[PDB]
Amino acid sequence: NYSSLNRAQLTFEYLHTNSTTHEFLFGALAELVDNARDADATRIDIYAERREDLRGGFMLCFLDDGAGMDPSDAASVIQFGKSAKRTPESTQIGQYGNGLKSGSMRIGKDFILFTKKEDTMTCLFLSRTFHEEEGIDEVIVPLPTWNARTREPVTDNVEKFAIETELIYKYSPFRTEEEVMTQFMKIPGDSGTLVIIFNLKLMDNGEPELDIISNPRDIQMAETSPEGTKPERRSFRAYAAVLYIDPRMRIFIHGHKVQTKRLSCCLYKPRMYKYTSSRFKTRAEQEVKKAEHVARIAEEKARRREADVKKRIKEAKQRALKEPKELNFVFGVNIEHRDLDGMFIYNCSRLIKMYEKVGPQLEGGMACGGVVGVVDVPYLVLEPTHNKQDFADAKEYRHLLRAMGEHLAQYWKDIAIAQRGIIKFWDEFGYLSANWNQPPSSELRYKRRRAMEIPTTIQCDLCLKWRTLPFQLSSYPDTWVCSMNPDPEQDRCEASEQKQKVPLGTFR
Amino acid sequence: MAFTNYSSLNRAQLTFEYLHTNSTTHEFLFGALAELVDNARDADATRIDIYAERREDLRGGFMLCFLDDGAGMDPSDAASVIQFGKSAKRTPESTQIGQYGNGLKSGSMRIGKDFILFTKKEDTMTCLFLSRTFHEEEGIDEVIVPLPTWNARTREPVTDNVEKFAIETELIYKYSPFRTEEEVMTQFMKIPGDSGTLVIIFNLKLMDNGEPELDIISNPRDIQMAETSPEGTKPERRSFRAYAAVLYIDPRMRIFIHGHKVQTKRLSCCLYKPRMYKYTSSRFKTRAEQEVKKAEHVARIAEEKARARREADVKKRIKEAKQRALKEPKELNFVFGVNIEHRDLDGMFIYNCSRLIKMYEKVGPQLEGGMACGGVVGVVDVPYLVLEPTHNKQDFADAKEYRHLLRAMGEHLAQYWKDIAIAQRGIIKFWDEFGYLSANWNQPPSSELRYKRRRAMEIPTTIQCDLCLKWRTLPFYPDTWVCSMNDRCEASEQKQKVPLGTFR
Ligand SMILES: Nc1ncnc2c1ncn2[C@@H]1O[C@H](COP(=O)(O)OP(=O)(O)NP(=O)(O)O)[C@@H](O)[C@H]1O
Ligand SMILES: Nc1ncnc2c1ncn2[C@@H]1O[C@H](COP(=O)(O)OP(=O)(O)NP(=O)(O)O)[C@@H](O)[C@H]1O
Ligand SMILES: [Mg+2]
Ligand SMILES: [Mg+2]
Ligand SMILES: [Zn+2]
Ligand SMILES: [Zn+2]
């Protein structure tokens, strides 16, 4: 019985240390968005309340209507590392167990979660302010659990509950049970979570680190974005537009839906190369081996159903001797924006590396001058880093970049636009100037010419199904729905999903 | 703290799975090893031998060790090694490179599955076996860590709870690479003096094929990356020898990799005509004033609560030193100098508190395609006020001000390039006379005799001692060298005066 031996413990100072992993504040917000997606939410409203007695001047909130949490799972939010998302496929982007505790502490000094599922209402006040102003070097976290209907306390230790509520009212932005209950009433259904991040991080001058008073329908970097600055890295709107490859959720920033785009959909002539990534053909067999000797580890762990779960994964990995034997590289020229190009790397639909030049693009010149690329890497070929902006395997990451470079060269010599004349190709679609970053011309005819090539896609708002309209609106674009769809067949909401056919090219 | 008995409220806890999550921060294995090297430097050690054993029954085939003769640790301080976040290295002038409290626990788990510390200070012998293997083979989830504390003279147990001691020794003998007590004591004898650490990292990570991630059977005097040498790869990012050569800006310690001293170099002086530019970063005095506004203020906050007192006096001591930090920090020092021996190895070599954090960072005209500033190198020692390091200590966690500094360095690099007047009189002719006579910019220098001498005349040659660790400037053998070879060990320290160029 290892009951007396020393145990590794956390401390107050570790929270800032954990926060330092995020050198990209949009990256920090992406963790809280990922948690919402993993909760199966269909709305992640990011409205920013305005409380001027808190550092920064405003509060950043995060509503949702996923599954929420219950007492045990909520308590397991302060159980650093513990993540039950380790399971077959099941996108569930979180695997490590510190994305909330690393994103909420890079944004503001404190953070107060509100959640409610089934018949429970749970608050998870974690505030560094408490620790600073009362000397606690551990990480103490109140956790009251009111009941959904009667809104009466539900816990065993009444003095614990009283103390918990006392801190929650004397430190949090809300100073009484009435206000806290009002916050709970902002989750209308019987499932959701309202993560709030009060006192914020101040830039040196004094203004907050997130700007909401320049473009009110947007969250932009408080630093004056100096030229350059590929549009995702200066606006949370643009970043969240391509923060997923398979968007089945709606992101209303400041009560305004983000025009989600699926990159690969909106491109000039796409060509989907099914590379086995040669290595990954081996690490399809070693993935079969990995899932074999990790299902064997699962058998060793089980020696029940978890091994059976991983055995069917192993059989599914022996099906990945077919299915994840090849990653899918989707090359397509981007006529509307030419300099916004480079590999758009996705690990399980969680865009990790962006605008990365691989192959001839590294060498200066029009060679692959505009080609975009996308690949969805599962959680077997590569894994992410702690910040989930880099991959923690340099060798095989560079292997994939080299592979993508060769296939990008093949795509370039397949489209043959250089043979027909790269200058003519880029001139006929509008770019008629010197600088390579010069934005397009408008001149009606050119807008139309660009428009014919790219097809139109628009997500619904009752079934969250994409469609293939010849026109466009929405549902900061204006509303539209499936019933209003001008189309003979794709008219109803019960109609089957449609996917674009992807023409294919072959390597070698 | 209790006050109203905060004893029932839930507390954030760690778990077994978090160790891998923490390990993931390091995407650079040399970066992982740098944490264990930094701990030794903070311990005032004058030797950080990285000899690798040959235990072949462990995964990987060998064990990676780290001996040193710094200050070691004691029972309490060693126990505070598993107190994630706790770090008493945040002190005025901060000669310690650690502030977070996470280098060992994040580097030892990127290298190998487990890690066993041995240490001995004053009259103590403390082992800190922390092995993921134990957790895996017994289902333990909260990270349990044995910690025996033998006495360093009698070699007898010194602890209260004998059952705890027996259990601790049992796991230490049943899981660690060495069984019994005699072997453990032999490991303790490897630390000869009365201060040191012998951090050991057994079972390793096994790159996919089966060979370990670290290569030690290609160049036995080097720990190379177990992977090919692609044509474009800066030497620091392939060889720990080259990485450790320029890991510090103020090397006052000897790094014997595989029982072989690393010829430590200071990039600040091994260059063609150097120029130190005294930029105030415009911001920096404003920033420096700003933290001096805060640092003094936040010093009152900790002092105000202690004003119950050791902290308050130290915060006051910090505050006067931070009042003096209204005088000392006003200008960083940008040291530009061309690198004739290797020109493709160029770019800003950023240092934060004498640790290297960013490597070969092209800024300014170098970002523009062309020979403009084609070879110029740069260095700056950023204090712990202007910028801070990231989780992995390879990026700075302030993008706005990091890019501000890079822009500033770009302008000053342009100024230096126009000041050396090398492009003014035939940059082709400059690189011609100093050896480069081929097509590619990356093509290595000429090797004919006269050109080697020509390169040699410009750059002076420095050499560290081996008794006082005092650098010398032998005017105008290589593995062992002392002061009386030039002119003596008691002689005053010598520093190269740096020519100064002014901005604007
Ligand atoms: N909006 C939410 N709805 C439901 N459960 C949630 C929500 N946010 C967080 N959780 C739970 O809290 C846990 C902790 O979240 P987080 O700190 O993001 O770690 P993770 O998501 O488990 N893994 P990672 O994202 O890799 O750190 C999650 O795994 C969920 O179990
Ligand atoms: N070789 C050593 N000699 C003496 N003390 C050591 C040594 N290695 C580690 N320690 C102690 O263990 C603590 C934890 O080390 P580490 O996990 O590296 O965090 P840190 O060194 O405190 N700060 P950081 O360098 O930012 O990680 C140190 O701060 C020292 O107190
Ligand atoms: Mg998560
Ligand atoms: Mg450290
Ligand atoms: Zn619909
Ligand atoms: Zn000497």
Author numbering:
A (entry chain A): 5 to 307, 343 to 514, 519 to 551
B (entry chain B): 1 to 307, 309, 343 to 510, 519 to 528, 534 to 551
Please, what does the article write about this entry?
The Microrchidia (MORC) family of chromatin-remodelling ATPases is pivotal in forming higher-order chromatin structures that suppress transcription. All MORCs share three features: an N-terminal gyrase, heat shock protein 90, histidine kinase and MutL (GHKL) ATPase domain, a central CW-type zinc finger (CW) domain, and a divergent C-terminal domain (CTD) with predicted coiled coils (CCs). Importantly, MORC2 mediates chromatin remodelling via ATP hydrolysis-dependent DNA compaction in vitro, regulated by the phosphorylation state of its CTD.
We determined the structures of MORC2PD and MORC2 ATPase domain with (MORC2PD-DNA, MORC21-603-DNA) and without DNA (MORC2PD, MORC21-603), in presence of AMP-PNP, at overall resolutions of 1.9, 2.5, 2.4 and 3.2 Å, respectively, using cryoEM.
